[PDB]
Amino acid sequence: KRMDCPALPPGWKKEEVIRKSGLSAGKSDVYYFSPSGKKFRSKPQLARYLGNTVDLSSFDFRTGKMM
Amino acid sequence: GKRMDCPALPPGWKKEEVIRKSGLSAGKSDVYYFSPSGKKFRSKPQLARYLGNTVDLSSFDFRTGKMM
DNA sequence: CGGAATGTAGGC
DNA sequence: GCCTACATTCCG
């Protein structure tokens, strides 16, 4: 389920992956993919790769949408 | 981190206070308790739910570990 | 997936 | 406006 994320620049994808077991069973992890295919696991990490090129202040990392 | 015995609780219960290093609440602290087996507790009701009627926590000050 | 580290809603 | 209590992130 690597789906296009319309809130980021073209080529950027989003994946949500369900945790299958343990204490956090049924919660999920959200990942982003740049055009090259770099995997990003957090909003600060994403903000660092992009820097001043994209304003992520309103960006909701979990849903992939601007608030 | 230092785990301090909490004399006010039953034998073996310990307390730790951790300073937040960054973010909005930087400089504030969080207090945690540990059972003698080492399970971590983060609030007074969590601690009350675990101990049940073995201890009365009505007067227990979570922050300081002191009965008031 | 865990869990230290931090965010944050709602009671006060 | 601040704190309690618990929700959630973020990196290992």
Swiss-Prot record, chain B:
Residues 1-67 form the MBD domain. It comes from the Eukaryota. The modification Phosphoserine is found at residue 35. Highly expressed in brain, heart, kidney, stomach, testis and placenta. Signal peptide: none annotated. It is found in: Nucleus; Chromosome. Transmembrane segments: none annotated. Heterodimer with MBD3 (via N-terminus). Component of the MeCP1 complex that contains HDAC1 and HDAC2. Component of the nucleosome remodeling and deacetylase (NuRD) repressor complex, composed of core proteins MTA1, MTA2, MTA3, RBBP4, RBBP7, HDAC1, HDAC2, MBD2, MBD3, and peripherally associated proteins CDK2AP1, CDK2AP2, GATAD2A, GATAD2B, CHD3, CHD4 and CHD5. The exact stoichiometry of the NuRD complex is unknown, and some subunits such as MBD2 and MBD3, GATAD2A and GATAD2B, and CHD3, CHD4 and CHD5 define mutually exclusive NuRD complexes. Interacts with CDK2AP1. Interacts with DHX9. Binds CpG islands in promoters where the DNA is methylated at position 5 of cytosine within CpG dinucleotides. Binds hemimethylated DNA as well. Recruits histone deacetylases and DNA methyltransferases to chromatin. Acts as a component of the histone deacetylase NuRD complex which participates in the remodeling of chromatin. Acts as a transcriptional repressor and plays a role in gene silencing. Functions as a scaffold protein, targeting GATAD2A and GATAD2B to chromatin to promote repression. May enhance the activation of some unmethylated cAMP-responsive promoters. This is Methyl-CpG-binding domain protein 2. It comes from Homo sapiens. The gene is MBD2.
